[PDB]
Structure formats: C-alpha cells, structure tokens
Design a binder for this molecule. Structure first.
Ligand SMILES: [Zn+2]
Ligand SMILES: [Zn+2]
Lengths: 340, 7, 346, 7
C-alpha cells in the first residue's frame, strides 16, 4: 500500500516553528524540531511510497517517523496512493483533503437525483454548481418566465432569454456546461400543497421558492410524511440563510424548535397583514450567491458522504453588513406538531 | 432570521 | 416632504411583543403596546405621506406617533417618498439600497460611472465580473492571458464546454455583454510574470485581484498599488476557507504588508530543510470547490459595490476575512495601518 | 489563512 502527499498541502516557517497544511486543517506546530520532522517525513511521499520504504528513505528515528506519518495521515495530508488516480479532476483534491476516495464520491454524485424546488436566484446558483460537480440527475421545478429584472442574480439568464421559461433556459445552459449529465423539467409553481405530489422522489430537495409565505411549512410537513430529505436556502433581506438540512429520523424538522415568527385584536392584525402582504425582499446578488453556494456544499456533502453538512439540525445566517455568522438550533422535538 | 420564513 | 414605508419591511408577533424589519436591521420590541403602536404608525406611511398627513390618519397620541416615526426613520424602514420613484432592470437592488438609507438613483449613477479592473479571470474573476456587470458597473476591464480548459468548468460559471481553447477574457466579455449590453467591457492579454508588468494595468476605481501567480503576486500588487495610489481588493481561498479582503484605500487604510499576518511559504534557516519546504510548496495545487470560490467572489463583489456606491461600509476595510466551509466559522485578520510599515509607512 | 497568500 503506497501513500502520496496531497497537492493541497503547503507549509511555512511561522513563529517558534511552522504551519502544516492550508485551510481548515492548518496546524501551527510550535516545536521547530517536530515541525522539521514533519517536512522530512512528508518529503518522502511527494512521489508515492510505502510506509517502510519511506522510513529507510527518511533521515529520522523510527519513533519520530511513526508519529509524523500518523499526523500526516490522520489529517489526510498523505492519502492512499490509489486516491490520486477528468472533468471533475478539480473537485478531486477537495474530496482527498477529507480522506475520501474521490472516484467513489464522484460515483455517488453521478448516481444521485436532485430536485431544485424553485428556479429563481438560489435555484440558478445551486443548479449550476451541482451540474458542474457531476450530480447525475437534476429536476428543475418552476413555472415562471424570465424577466429582465432577474438578470441581477439569476446567473444562467441573458438579455436574449427574457420571456422564455426559466426551467427551459437553465436546462440548456446546464447541458452546455456539463453534457455528461441529465436534466429534467417540470413546469410548476407550488400555489397549493397538493402540487407537492407532482414533485418527484429524490436524494434531496433544494427548497428556495419564496411564495407562498408558508411554502417551507408545506414542504416540511410533506417531506416528513414522504420520508424526503430537503434543504431550505434563501435570505432575509441582507442576511444569507441556508439550512436546515432535514434528514428523516436523524434531524429535527423545521417546526420542531420554532425558531421563526409567522408573518400572518381586531384593529392591529388587519394592519399587520396589510404590511406583510406588500413585502418585497431587498434582493442582492452577493447575499443570494452565499446562501446558494453553502446550500450547494451541503447537498454535495450529504450525497457525497465525505464530510458532515453544516446545516444538519441548524438554520444558519451569514450577515452581509457585519462580519457575523449565527446558527439557530433545529434539534429534534417530541412536542412537534409534524414529527413529534 | 426570525421575521417570517426565508425569502 | 413625503415619507413612505419600504417594501422590504416585515413585522411579526413574537415573544411579549414583536419583530420589526427583516435582516440585519431586525428589531425585537419587548412591549406589546409599543410594538402595536409601531405597526400603526408604519401603516400610515404605506402611501407616500408627510409626517402631518400620516399623523392625521393615526389613532394614537402624537407623542407616541412621534417616537415610532423616529424609530422607523432612523432604521430606514420609512424613506423619502422620492426614493421609490422607478420597471428598471436594477430595481431589486434598489430595495437593498433603500434599506441602508440611500437614494437608489444616486448609487446606480455612481456605479454607471465606475471603472473596475478584473485582474485574474479565473473562478473568482468570473463570479465577480458577472455580479458587477449585472449590477450596472459602467466599465469592466478583464485582464488574463490564460486559455479556457475543461477543468475550469467547476467554478467558472460563464464558461461552457464549447469555449475550451478560447481566451478567458474573450468569452467572459461575450458572456457579460449578453447579460448587460448597457455596459462597456474591455480585455487586456496579460499575466503578471514580473512586478514590471503591473505598469501595463490601467487605472480604475478599484482593482479586483484574484490571480494567484506567482505566489507573491499580492505582494507585488500591494507595493505597486501603494505607490500608484490605486485601491484594490483581494479575494480567493486557502483550500476550504473562502477569503476576501483586504480592501486597500490609499491614506485611509492599512496595506497588505502593515500587520504581517501571513507567513512566507518558501524560506527557512537550514538549507537541507529549506530545499524540502521549497519542493513541497512548489507542488501546491489548491483544493478548489465551487461553493468556496463562490462565497469569496460574492462577498468581494458586495464590497466593491459598496465601495463605489458609498451606501454602507465595505466589510474588508482594514481586514482580511475568512469563512470556513467545514465548520460554522468566520474570522477576520487585522490589516490596519502600521506607522512602522516599510511599504506605506515612514 | 496564514500559510502563504490566498490562491
Ligand atoms: Zn418537527
Ligand atoms: Zn503598509
């Protein structure tokens, strides 16, 4: 069994010693002696090598090589040589860095079916990421037509596409970018709960349609009964939102913890309803794109099985006018009117 | 994050 | 002298009172009597109304109406009636501009007259350019000498399979113009091989810098930009962490070098060890992942739009911000001015 | 965020 140093590894002299790795797994090694033994060990694996071969090759004691080799391996800085073996060959480094065999992740994605419930800003951004990552089947669900006003967020759409069906244009634009996949169309907005039964079974539903106001409440109840995984994404004006990632029998549902206040005394509640009915989201592409990007990451991870999705049992907000991220707990509840 | 559902 | 309630305001019964507004400005008012009073006054501004005209329709004491009006106004829940006079392609951005107490037409006009250099047209440059294009930036200058590959298709959302072999700047320009034909797009066939090459990059309102070649590219760009009095923003990733900032503004902000926050890859004491460091690093290839690239590009574009629009403070002023993808975590590295800095100091 | 510059 050969091992190889991942190309995503990098190091640097820093402080008392140095840094090993980039991104989340970056570790400051304080002991310079130890830091140096890690590089000496890592150097043996630039080209694939067995444990024993590299031990003789390294100019360091067996006891140190063991610990250093373990450190590298436990952090997936060095992976099984076979994992190094394409279109998606860019995403392969990402999966390797999490200790997954990229081919087996890629295979899972190819075998997956994803419903995109709403093809506005979020659906545009999610669908293209999933397509170019190699999600095997995509089901596009929307009945609205492209308007010029859409172009600000809905990245697949062009001035010449205005008037045409959203589902139609996404589909064409997707196949242009990844011809190896299959895309499906369903011309349908959810104006009535019963419209959900026209939504096909899938590995997961990406839910981002913003009308009616209680759409996520209709999806929640239906997906529980239907044992159907879903993830909500969107925004509350300037705050990007993604989660929860509902997993039947594993997570709480949207309704469990009641983290949200419903939009809709004689005199006041009529005035509230009037205000809320006039509501239009202050949409902004940067916010749309964040929610969509992280939504997409979670679906890839959920299906790929290589890392835990962030939005399991959580509804996550990222601010755009402050440096701030906040999650609301969506843990399971026995008192829930849907899945208690 | 609390005023209605996500949009 | 009319005021109008913004479309972007929503309210909800919650706790002992209720919520007012959505997003960052969301307020929870504890008192039920106050919250209901805020709803009553806001209801009076549904139609463009002066304070006196709206008050005339209120059924609450004037002192209360006055405090609620003040509340609503300070949070830009009600805005100057005129700010709502627009069918326009940029209309959905207008509610965003309104919500920060800005005149939408004025922000848009500042964007029209802006010139932005996209230095590097990879995954970041793709997402930033299209955000800026469809938001109405008047002039976008694309700078890259690379060609489109099949491996690009992961993050580079403008590119298609048929684009393989073509120049990046050429296809981006084409794809931008199909989205916003009202804007001007130019392209410059250049990769920064040496510091000297930077002189070939035109002046603009800001440079969006996302090219990662060579490895000290941002050090060159910074040094140059300090000496050229040129604002720039950096954006990229370090594998699974999305990175954007700093946004350098000559004389108002720290430069990349001020705080010395990032470690220099190649370099040690012992040569035996130094050679190995240099080889390990020379073989570095980033673990790219669209969601990470997209987050970095999105927040970068937001900062450029606010930098030029002037309606809210860019986030990455004096800061290099990281957003994690495998945990719920955001971290900013201080990049404020240092009097001691050998690049922009003394 | 520390190991060299951003890519
Ligand atoms: Zn529940
Ligand atoms: Zn400085």
């Amino acid at each position: 069994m050969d091992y190889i140093l991942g190309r995503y590894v990098k190091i640097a002299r820093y402080g008392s010693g140095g840094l090993v790795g980039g991104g989340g797994k970056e570790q400051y090694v304080e002991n310079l002696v130890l830091w140096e033994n890690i590089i000496k060990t890592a150097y043996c694996f630039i080209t694939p090598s067995s444990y024993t071969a590299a031990l003789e090759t390294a100019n360091i004691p067996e006891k140190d090589f063991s610990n250093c080799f373990r450190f590298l391996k436990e952090n997936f800085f060095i992976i099984p040589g076979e994992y190094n073996n394409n279109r998606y060959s860019r995403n392969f480094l990402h999966y390797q860095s999490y200790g997954a065999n990229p081919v087996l992740v890629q295979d899972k994605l190819k075998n997956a079916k994803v419903v995109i419930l709403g093809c506005g800003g979020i659906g545009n951004h999610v669908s293209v990421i999933l397509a170019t990552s190699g999600i095997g089947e995509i089901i596009l669900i929307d009945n609205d037509q492209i308007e010029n006003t859409n172009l600000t967020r809905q990245v697949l759409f062009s001035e010449d596409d205005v008037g045409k069906n959203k589902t139609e244009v996404i589909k064409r634009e997707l196949l242009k970018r990844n011809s190896e996949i299959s895309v499906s169309e369903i011309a349908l907005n959810i104006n009535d709960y019963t419209d959900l039964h026209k939504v096909p079974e899938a590995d997961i539903w990406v839910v981002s349609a913003d009308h009616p106001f209680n759409l996520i409440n209709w999806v929640n109840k239906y997906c529980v009964r239907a044992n159907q995984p879903y993830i909500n994404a969107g925004y509350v004006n300037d705050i990007a939102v993604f989660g929860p990632l509902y997993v039947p029998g594993k997570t709480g549902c949207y309704e469990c913890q009641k983290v949200v206040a419903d939009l809709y005394k004689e005199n006041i509640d009529h005035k509230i309803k009037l205000i809320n009915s006039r509501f239009k989201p202050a949409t902004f592409a940067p916010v749309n794109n964040v929610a969509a990007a992280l939504c997409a990451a979670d679906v890839i991870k959920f299906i790929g099985k290589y890392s835990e999705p962030l939005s399991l049992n959580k509804r996550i907000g990222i601010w755009s006018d402050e440096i701030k991220i906040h999650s609301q707990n969506m843990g399971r509840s026995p008192v829930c009117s849907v899945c208690g | 994050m609390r005023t209605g559902n996500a949009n």
